[PDB]
Amino acid sequence: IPATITERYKVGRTIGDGNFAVVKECVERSTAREYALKIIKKSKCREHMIQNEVSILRRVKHPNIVLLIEEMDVPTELYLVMELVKGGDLFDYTERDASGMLYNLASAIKYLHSLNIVHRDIKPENLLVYEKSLKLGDFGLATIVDGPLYTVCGTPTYVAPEIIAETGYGLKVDIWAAGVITYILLCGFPPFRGSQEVLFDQILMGQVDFPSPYWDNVSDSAKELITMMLLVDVDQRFSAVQVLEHPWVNHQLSVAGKIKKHF
Ligand SMILES: CCN1C(=O)c2ccccc2N(C)c2nc(Nc3ccc(N4CCN(C)CC4)cc3OC)ncc21
């Protein structure tokens, strides 16, 4: 850790240990304010999968997206001081609670889409909870849409069918991932479960089903919203605006004791 960081910040324990970065909690010495420190290891050769994610982060300012406070660039790694969300991810209850979560998620997705940004890795692990409100994070896979995209990326559970097809995709792959998440929030398991290729062939059909007994006491409005969010026809599929105008975003759920089993 370089002296430039420690002069102003006090790095602490590790709260995020992915394969692509390290996150730690830290305190600004001047103001005794908590923040998060993202440490991104650079390639041993002296670069654009890091710079791009930073270029994205300098443009995003929304109450439902983890905020970039400041950045320090160093030869071996790049240090990002970001806002700290102390609640944990989506894993860490009612249709009323879940509907507010999609509202936060769709407000972020709507904001990003106005800047032609596609997140391409929206999943529960990348959604953080303030004590509830959600905040979207990890813009490593985000990119600006200037044309159809053909790169297959993201965790296969939340990947849209047109990504699997490799025919071209765009801004509406984030609505699909949000639909899968909302589906999970209501019953605790994913719409397409598979049995590696079986999952891909299942998603490509796009048969969203609400089985019994889990989906019996969930409103038809949520079913209608989820079905419109998970439409294989991209043109028909809902936009972030269409999701936010839906009445379900504007009854206890037996969901936890099954999220721990499936994930
Ligand atoms: C650099 C900014 N940032 C992201 O960009 C970010 C984006 C996506 C995912 C994780 C991120 N990291 C790690 C972030 N994680 C958090 N918060 C957070 C999270 C988890 C925990 N625990 C750790 C201990 N185990 C046992 C329970 C959970 C504790 C946390 O805060 C105290 N606030 C901001 C993040």
Residue numbers in the entry: 382 to 427, 430 to 475, 483 to 521, 527 to 590, 594 to 648, 658 to 670
The authors write:
Doublecortin-like kinase 1 (DCLK1) is a multi-domain bi-functional protein that belongs to the protein kinase superfamily and the doublecortin (DCX) family within the microtubule-associated protein (MAP) superfamily. Doublecortin-like kinase 1 (DCLK1) is an understudied bi-functional kinase with a proven role in tumour growth and development. Multiple isoforms of DCLK1 exist, generated by alternative splicing. Here, we report the crystal structures of DCLK1 kinase domain in complex with DCLK1-IN-1 and its precursors.
Based on our initial structural information, two compounds were designed by Ferguson et al., introducing ethyl (FMF-03-055-1) and trifluoroethyl (DCLK1-IN-1) substituents at the R4 position 28 to improve selectivity towards DCLK1 by targeting the deep hydrophobic back pocket surrounded by residues Leu440, Val449, Met465 and the backbone of the DFG loop. To better understand how the ethyl substitution at position R4 provided increased potency towards DCLK1 and increased selectivity over ERK5, we solved the crystal structure of DCLK1-Cter:FMF-03-055-1 (residues 372-686) to 3.1 Å resolution. The backbone H-bond interactions mediated by Val468 located in the hinge region are still conserved in DCLK1-Cter:FMF-03-055-1. Our crystal structure reveals that the R4 ethyl group in FMF-03-055-1 indeed mediates additional contacts with Lys419, Ala417, Val404 and the gatekeeper residue Met465 as compared to the R4 methyl in XMD8-85. In addition to enhancing binding to DCLK1, the R4 ethyl substitution also decreased off-target binding to ERK5. This could be attributed to the presence in ERK5 of a leucine instead of methionine as the gatekeeper residue (Leu137). The structures of DCLK1-KD in complex with the benzopyrimido-diazipinone scaffold analogues XMD8-85 and FMF-03-055-1 show a conventional type I binding mode and in both cases the glycine loop collapses allowing extensive interactions with ring B and ring D contributing to their affinity towards DCLK1. The key positioning of the methyl group in XMD8-85 and the ethyl group in FMF-03-055-1 at position R4 towards the gatekeeper residue, which controls the access to the back pocket within the ATP binding site, along with the difference in the nature of the gatekeeper residue between DCLK1 (Met465) and ERK5 (Leu137) have highlighted how selectivity for DCLK1 over ERK5  can be achieved. Binding of both XMD8-85 and FMF-03-055-1 stabilised by vdw interactions between ring A and Gly532 that precedes the DFG motif. It is likely that these interactions are contributing to the stabilisation of the activation loop in an active conformation with both the DFG motif and the αC helix adopting a typical active-in conformation stabilised by the canonical salt bridge interaction between β3 strand lysine (Lys419) and the αC helix glutamate (Glu436).
